[PDB]
Curated annotation (Swiss-Prot):
Compartments where located: Nucleus
Domain Bromo stretches: 3-114
Induction (UniProt): Up-regulated in breast, uterus, colon, ovary, and stomach tumors. Induced in breast cancer cells overexpressing NCOA3 or treated with estrogen. Down-regulated in 5-fluorouracil-resistant derivatives of the colon cancer cell line HCT 116.
Protein name as it appears in the record: ATPase family AAA domain-containing protein 2
Function: May be a transcriptional coactivator of the nuclear receptor ESR1 required to induce the expression of a subset of estradiol target genes, such as CCND1, MYC and E2F1. May play a role in the recruitment or occupancy of CREBBP at some ESR1 target gene promoters. May be required for histone hyperacetylation. Involved in the estrogen-induced cell proliferation and cell cycle progression of breast cancer cells.
Domain of life: Eukaryota
Disulfide-bonded cysteines: none
Entry coiled-coil feature ranges: 108-130
UniProt similarity note: Belongs to the AAA ATPase family.
Tissues with expression: Highly expressed in estrogen receptor positive breast tumors and in osteosarcoma tumors.
Residues of the whole record sequence present: 981 to 1108 of 1390
Transmembrane intervals: none
Subunit structure: Interacts with ESR1 and NCOA3 and these interactions are enhanced by estradiol. Interacts with acetylated lysine residues on histone H1.4, H2A, H2B and H3 (in vitro).
């Protein structure tokens, strides 16, 4: 229905705003665009599902997220991809893992403080009915 389309449009607006706040945070710069294979050649072969904040914006706009849970699965993927690709003890790997974890923690914390749980519940119920 049109009321259901209004619900998903509100969800999209909410998701774009959270994503924008992550994207402008200096710590999360390396997650703003896809990992370039010319700068990191083995990435696309090791990481099966690359994910970054620009691709998240693209997926919001294509109506790929019908719930906050679906969006958070992609935020989790930005984090898990960095934990998997950079697992070493060296400072370079530890810094990207800490930034990855901080990106995930920030997204969850924004959603915990600003998302009405009845709004998410409505999205899930419209999703389950389709
Ligand atoms: C997100 O995961 C990674 C990111 C980088 C990294 O420093 N990047 C990546 C992505 C990117 C995107 C926007 C701006 C800067 C950057 C820098 C430079 N070029 C890149 O391709 C390195 C990683 O491992 C060596 C790695 O797992």
């Amino acid at each position: 229905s049109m009321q259901e389309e209004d619900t998903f449009r509100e969800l999209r607006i909410f998701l774009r705003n959270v994503t924008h706040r992550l994207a402008i945070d200096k710590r999360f710069r390396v997650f703003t665009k896809p990992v370039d294979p010319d700068e990191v050649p083995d990435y696309v072969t090791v990481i099966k599902q690359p994910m970054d904040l620009s691709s998240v914006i693209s997926k919001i706009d294509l109506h790929k997220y019908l719930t906050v849970k679906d969006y958070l699965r992609d935020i989790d993927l930005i984090c898990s991809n960095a934990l998997e690709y950079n697992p070493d003890r060296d400072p370079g790997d530890r810094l990207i893992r800490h930034r990855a974890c901080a990106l995930r923690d920030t997204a969850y914390a924004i959603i915990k403080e600003e998302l009405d749980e009845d709004f998410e519940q409505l999205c899930e119920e419209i999703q389950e009915s389709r």
